[PDB]
């Protein structure tokens, strides 16, 4: 060997100033690098008359999902650039009651975040539609018939009709079906049939 | 001194299509570690406050699942080893969010979701009555 | 400049190779963690956030009525009798299946149409007429 | 066990929601259940229960030959097999075995 054994350089933590831009050191989520973290942090159960294991060669610190990439300074700086990406919520809808008056129909959909190579999840196709019967243009006859048609889908205590659609594979297809069912149920309730006179 | 002179901001276009209104967002995060959820809660709450988003946080009761396995490879029925998988919860309740506002906040927090943590976002969308239900046709 | 470019004509290999040299001068290695995820998202290796469980999945752009209303595929079947009653259960069951595409659902419907055609003689002895 | 108004109203609801309209007994309702769900075999759990052991074993075997993977377990059997040839306990040729 012409040269000696390769010598590891001193860790770059020694070259970091006390007023350095820390978020630049950890831009994204990264595993705990002892040569990159200028903190004398120790982790591990100490032996009798012992000390917690040093950060160097520490596997326990490597298994911690550390938030070094989400320091409070970075979080406030990250949101500053994201303000242009959002939109102002309408000030007219001050409370929930104002929201109900103008938007009486509520649609519920669920999204799941899981770790893996496959993002498919059968539970995401479910679409739930809730609407109060008081906000619908219903007379006495149609309202009484609508409750019987839906059965238990209508809650008398809250006066809220809940329709759950999950037949179609896609969430958008289930959303259309929920809107379609509400349209058909409303019109069919208004329709008066000859056999209804036998009630 | 080697700072950039001019920065090219990402292109954001204000389309003519009206936005979607989300009444509530129930961001529930599940994990095996309470400290990780507490740290993730601090990140999510702080991000919401800086974005002007109303958020309320509560902790759903935890779920623990236990199952029993034989200890010895052969016989010895009376001796068992019992394992458990603790699922700890943390619910984030965002209110009065637009479609664009909820899209950015979710992307910011989902990409920063720690490993071993799953998220279930329940999105409540406000919609008006369909045009066909305005008046009866019969 | 030119009003109407020849975009319809496929560019030659010289044109394609020239464009590659244009991307070379602008090609630089990754500078930080953000640039790696940006490149992966553009290349499609990384998931697109916010998470959509139906990203890249669209079953031939089918509408909800295609999955649910399957009576248009029972025209060949008899309008009344046990066969119509039996196929009504099948269509009702198929309308409740979210794991089968519209094309797959039609295959099940077409299977009974061909099956009863082969078994016309048996059906005739039971006072049932198919086609 | 229902009146005319209740029976027809219930039947009307089934048509609206796409449920079964004609009167069907419990036995024949299984046909609805059969096509409403995937069969047991068609489920991803069933046909993909095992990992492709052909893919896993042959890939590592190929990578071992390419020298990019060192199979410590395989090197153990190769050495043990080699020592048996020196000891004479070599695998007999197929067909031309000890018994004929």
């Amino acid at each position: 060997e012409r040269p000696p054994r390769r010598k590891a350089l001193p860790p770059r933590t020694e070259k970091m100033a006390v007023d350095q831009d820390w978020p630049s050191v950890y831009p994204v989520a990264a595993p705990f690098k002892p040569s990159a973290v200028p903190l004398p942090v120790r982790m591990g159960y100490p032996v009798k008359k012992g000390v917690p294991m040093a950060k160097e060669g520490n596997l326990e610190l490597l298994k911690i999902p550390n938030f070094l990439h989400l320091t409070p300074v970075a979080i406030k700086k990250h949101c500053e650039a994201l303000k242009d990406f959002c939109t102002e919520w309408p000030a007219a809808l001050d409370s929930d009651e104002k929201c109900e008056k103008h938007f009486p129909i509520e649609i519920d959909s669920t999204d799941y975040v899981s770790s893996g190579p496959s993002v498919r999840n059968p539970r995401a196709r479910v679409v739930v539609l809730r609407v109060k019967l008081s906000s619908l243009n219903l007379d006495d006859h149609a309202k009484k018939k609508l409750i019987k048609l839906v059965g238990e889908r209508y809650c008398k205590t809250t006066d809220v009709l809940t329709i759950k659609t999950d037949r179609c594979p896609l969430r958008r297809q289930n959303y259309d079906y929920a809107v379609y069912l509400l349209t058909v149920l409303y019109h069919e309730s208004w329709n008066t049939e000859e056999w209804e006179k036998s009630k | 001194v080697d700072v950039p002179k001019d920065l090219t901001k990402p292109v954001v276009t204000i389309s003519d299509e009206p936005d979607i209104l989300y009444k509530r967002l129930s961001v529930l995060v599940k994990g095996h570690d309470k400290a990780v959820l507490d740290s993730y809660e601090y990140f999510a709450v702080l991000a919401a406050k800086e974005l002007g988003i109303s958020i309320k946080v509560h902790e759903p009761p935890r779920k623990i699942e236990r199952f029993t396995l034989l200890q010895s490879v052969h016989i010895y029925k009376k001796h068992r080893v019992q394992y458990e998988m603790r699922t700890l919860y943390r619910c984030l309740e965002l209110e009065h969010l637009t479609g664009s506002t909820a899209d950015v906040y979710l992307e910011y927090i989902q990409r920063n979701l720690p490993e071993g943590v799953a998220m279930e976002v329940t999105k409540t969308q406000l919609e008006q009555l369909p045009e066909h239900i305005k008046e009866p046709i019969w | 400049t030119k009003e109407a470019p020849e975009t319809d004509t496929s560019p030659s290999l010289w044109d394609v190779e020239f464009a590659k040299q244009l991307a070379t001068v602008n090609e630089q290695p990754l500078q930080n963690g953000f640039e790696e995820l940006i490149q992966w998202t553009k290349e499609g290796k990384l998931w697109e956030f916010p998470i959509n469980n139906e990203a890249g999945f669209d079953d031939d752009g089918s509408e909800f009525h295609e999955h649910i209303f399957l009576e248009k595929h029972l025209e060949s079947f008899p309008k009344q009798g046990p066969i119509r009653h039996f196929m009504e259960l099948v269509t009702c069951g198929l309308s409740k299946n979210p794991y089968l595409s519209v094309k797959q659902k039609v295959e099940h419907i077409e299977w009974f149409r061909n099956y009863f055609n082969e078994k016309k003689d048996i059906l005739k002895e039971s006072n049932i007429q198919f086609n | 066990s229902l009146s005319e108004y209740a029976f027809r109203m219930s039947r009307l609801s089934a048509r609206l929601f796409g449920e079964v309209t004609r009167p069907t007994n419990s036995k024949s309702m299984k046909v609805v259940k059969l096509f409403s769900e995937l069969p047991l075999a068609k489920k991803k759990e069933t046909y993909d229960w095992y990992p492709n052991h052909h893919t896993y074993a042959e890939l590592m075997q190929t990578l071992r030959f390419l020298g990019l993977y060192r199979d410590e377990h395989q090197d153990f059997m190769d050495e043990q097999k080699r020592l048996k040839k020196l000891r004479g306990k070599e695998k007999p040729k197929k067909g031309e075995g000890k018994r004929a």
């Binding site: 379609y180 349209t183 058909v184 019109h187 069919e188 | 045009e131 | 209303f69 009576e71 | 005319e4 048509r15």
Partner: peptide, 26 residues
């Protein structure tokens, strides 16, 4: 005892195809 009634044998009208087909859009 077999209970058969006139209304129990009446086929339900396919209102989706005929009456409410216009509602599949918008």
């Amino acid at each position: 005892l077999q209970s058969r009634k006139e209304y129990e044998q009446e086929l339900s009208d396919d209102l989706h195809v005929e009456r409410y087909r216009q509602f599949w859009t918008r």
